[PDB]
């Protein structure tokens, strides 16, 4: 059963969590092919592992930039968590290592590109299309939350599509293993739960709020709360008012009212019944949860796949050197990495 | 339309995370 699967999953996770894998490859074991996208203290590249000819996504973080942005502990979280998890809709680390200048995390490559790109281009997804993706997020969060992990950055930008049209939740920069409340102000403005904005201690309920935002955005083509400046967005989020497009089904609107619920005693996912309030909602009535986990459902969108190492579903970014200083930077800060 | 207001806004591209 679910409870049995999750218990065994936790036993597997805890062993790796308590004894993390370290220094399991080196940069010269890979050929760098192309930049798939960038962040403030790093980038993700398509690389080929020369030993096997396997293609991977390689996240390269500049240690000095991580330090400057005060993301040391969050980065240690990311690596420690991703080396320890294993789930169909996440990319665990296949390898990790560091050198004088950088931190490296190597993960399965998803060639379908970002959900963001497809969503913006197509405009919006149909409810069945949005439900297919939402189901995979619901199961991922059930998995993560059972391990006491909060994800804290759900958005289309972080959801990659694989060759079969299924999704991978990527970028665990703000993921954290916490049993109680936590306080860090982090996430993306449009996706922040009101608890975060109002500087309360918060818990995994923020991920279920974020799911409400994602489902809304996928179905409408725009998010429930937007403006030109974040402060205007925060005002809208706290106010306790959302409007649904006329094409939203009755079922969809009701699910969203229960996900985008400022009252934590009423928010779906955070009640006595837990995730099953979501799984057994009418909007998910046609969802076969086991078939989705097993990846037996036919995807409503399958991406263009011209071959191995194809990058056509990603945008182009200016390619820059991976420079490795002759002096070790930030040795003590990232010793456990 | 709300669609038109969205597309004319400055938040249709990839959105950056915030942090303290
Ligand atoms: Cl430091 C950094 C660099 C790039 C990213 C983004 C990113 C790009 C590509 C991938 C990625 N693409 C393909 N296959 C992957 N497996 C694991 N991550 C993958 C993940 C995150 C996040 C989502 N928007 C685009 C940039 C996040 C953080």
Cα angle A312, A314, A318 (rounded to 5 degrees) comes to: 105
Closest CA to A60 of A47, A50, A73: A47
Residue A276: is it exposed, middle or buried by C-beta count within 10 angstroms (0-12/13-18/19+)? middle
Which residue, by CA, sits nearest to atom 6 of ligand 1? A37
Give helix A127-146 / helix A2-18 axis angle, nearest 10°: 60
Domain around A109:
20-113+305-335
Measured CA to CA, the distance from residue A105 to residue A97 in angstroms comes to: 7
Closest CA to A172 of A183, A186, A162: A186
Residue A131, CB-side half-sphere exposure with 13 Å CA sphere:
21
Nearest to A222 among B3, B15, B18 (CB): B3
- Does one domain contain both A256 and A188? yes
Written as six digits, the tokens of A332 are: 């003590």
Q: Which residue has the tokens 């950056």?
A: B16
Q: What is the DSSP letter of A251?
A: H
Cα angle A292, A85, A135 (rounded to 5 degrees) comes to: 25
Give helix A250-259 / helix A205-220 axis angle, nearest 10°: 150
Written as six digits, the tokens of A308 are: 């191995």
Helix (H, G, I), strand (E, B) or coil at A55: strand
| Number of the ligand 1 atom closest to the C-alpha atom of A42 | 1
Q: What is the resolution of this structure in A?
A: 2.0
**A12, A99, A148, A153: which is the annotated catalytic residue?**
A153
- Does one domain contain both A158 and A256? yes
Do A37 and A46 form a contact (C-beta atoms < 8 A)?
no
- Does one domain contain both A108 and A121? no
Written as six digits, the tokens of A150 are: 């909060």
Q: Beta strand pairing status for A54-62 and A113-114?
A: unpaired
Measured from the CB, is residue A161 less than 6 Å from ligand 1?
no
Closest CA to A78 of A270, A275, A334: A334
- What is the CATH number for A39? 3.30.200.20
- Does one domain contain both A10 and A32? no
Measured CA to CA, the distance from residue A116 to residue A111 in angstroms comes to: 14
Active site (annotated) includes residue A153: yes
Do A300 and A160 form a contact (C-beta atoms < 8 A)?
no
Measured CA to CA, the distance from residue A195 to residue A203 in angstroms comes to: 9
- Does one domain contain both A239 and A259? yes
- Does one domain contain both A108 and A124? no
Measured CA to CA, the distance from residue A109 to residue A57 in angstroms comes to: 5
DSSP letters, A155-200, are: SGGGEEE-TTS-EEE---TT-EE-SS-B---EE-GGG--HHHHTT-
| Terminal-residue alpha carbon distance, chain A | 35
- Does one domain contain both A206 and A312? no
Q: Which residues pair with A55 in a beta bridge?
A: A48
Q: In what order do the strands lie in the sheet with A42-49?
A: A30-38, A42-49, A54-62, A102-108, A93-98
If one counts the domains in chain A, the total is 2
Q: Which experimental approach was used here? A: X-ray
Q: Phi then psi for A201, rounded to 5 degrees?
A: -65, 135
Q: Which residue has the tokens 């049995």?
A: A4
Measured CA to CA, the distance from residue A222 to residue A240 in angstroms comes to: 18
Measured CA to CA, the distance from residue A122 to residue A100 in angstroms comes to: 43
**Nearby residues of A232 by Cβ (< 8 Å), 6 or more positions away:** none
């Amino acid at each position: 059963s679910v409870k049995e699967f999750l218990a065994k999953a936790k036993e597997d996770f805890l062993k790796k969590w308590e004894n993390p894998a370290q220094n399991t490859a080196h940069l010269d074991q890979f050929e760098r092919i192309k930049t798939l996208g960038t962040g403030s203290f790093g980038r993700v590249m398509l690389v080929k592992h020369m030993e096997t000819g396997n293609h991977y996504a390689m996240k390269i973080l500049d240690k000095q930039k991580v330090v400057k942005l005060k993301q040391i502990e969050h980065t240690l979280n990311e690596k420690r968590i991703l080396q320890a998890v294993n789930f169909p809709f996440l990319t665990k680390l296949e390898f990790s290592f560091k050198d004088n200048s950088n931190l490296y995390m190597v993960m399965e490559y998803a060639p379908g590109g970002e959900m963001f790109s497809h969503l913006r281009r197509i405009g919006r997804f149909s409810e069945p299309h949005a439900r297919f993706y939402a189901a995979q997020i619901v199961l991922t969060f059930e998995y993560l939350h059972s391990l006491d992990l909060i994800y804290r950055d759900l958005k289309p930008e972080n959801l990659m599509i694989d060759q079969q049209g299924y999704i991978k939740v990527t970028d665990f920069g703000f993921a954290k293993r916490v049993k109680g409340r936590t306080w860090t102000l982090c996430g993306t403005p449009e996706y922040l739960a009101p608890e975060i904005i109002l500087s309360k201690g918060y818990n995994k309920a923020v991920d279920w709020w974020a799911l409400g935002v994602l489902i809304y955005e996928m179905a409408a083509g725009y998010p429930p709360f937007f403006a030109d400046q974040p402060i205007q967005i925060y005002e809208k989020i706290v106010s306790g008012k959302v409007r649904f497009p006329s094409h939203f089904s009755s079922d969809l609107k009701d699910l969203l009212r229960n996900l985008l619920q400022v009252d934590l005693t009423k928010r779906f996912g955070n009640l006595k019944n837990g995730v099953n309030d979501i799984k057994n909602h009418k909007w998910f009535a046609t969802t076969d949860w086991i078939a989705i986990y097993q990846r037996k459902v036919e995807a409503p969108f399958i991406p263009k796949f011209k071959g191995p190492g194809d990058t056509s579903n990603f945008d182009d970014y200016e390619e820059e050197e991976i420079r490795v200083s002759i002096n070790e930077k930030c040795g003590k800060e990232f010793s456990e990495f | 339309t709300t669609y038109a207001d969205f597309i004319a806004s400055g938040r249709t591209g990839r959105r950056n995370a915030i942090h303290d």
